[PDB]
Design a protein around this ligand. Sequence first.
Ligand code: ZNH
Length: 154
Amino acid sequence: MVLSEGEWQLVLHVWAKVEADVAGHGQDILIRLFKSHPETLEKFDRFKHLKTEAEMKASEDLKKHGVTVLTALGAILKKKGHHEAELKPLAQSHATKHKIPIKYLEFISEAIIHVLHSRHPGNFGADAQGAMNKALELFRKDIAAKYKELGYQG
Ligand code: ZNH
């Protein structure tokens, strides 16, 4: 699959708003993820003890993680599909150390879309949401191919 330049621009124009407060968007996204799919929290030996949204919002380590995740994703999006270099180390750590199935990447993709839709109705209409879905699908497809090369079922 390949996105058009117009699709990339819709993706990057909403990402520009995310970048006003990457930390806040990261918290909202991780919390949505853990609330919708509580099993995903079990992957974080650092965070699996957090019991409530309140505890999640007050966690500095969780905030730090959201910034790390969104900054990595932002870098990948900015490559506009030319993301092999960024994807290599990410695919290896997530296949081999963290053991994150593609299904869980689908879950966080859903959380991203939900938070953007809630926070950014001005820049996340149907067309922009479609473009973001296409970008995240491409990310997941490319990660999935790497998983396979690396020996992980995903
Ligand atoms: C979209 C998307 C995404 C992105 C971009 C990311 C990114 C990332 C980064 C950058 C980091 C740091 C470095 C490495 O590699 O290690 C990480 C880590 C990581 N991660 Zn991940 N992620 C993700 C998804 C995910 C999910 C979904 C999960 C689960 C479920 C995860 C789990 C993880 C973990 C567990 C870790 C580690 C943490 C700590 O701190 O230790 N993850 N991550």
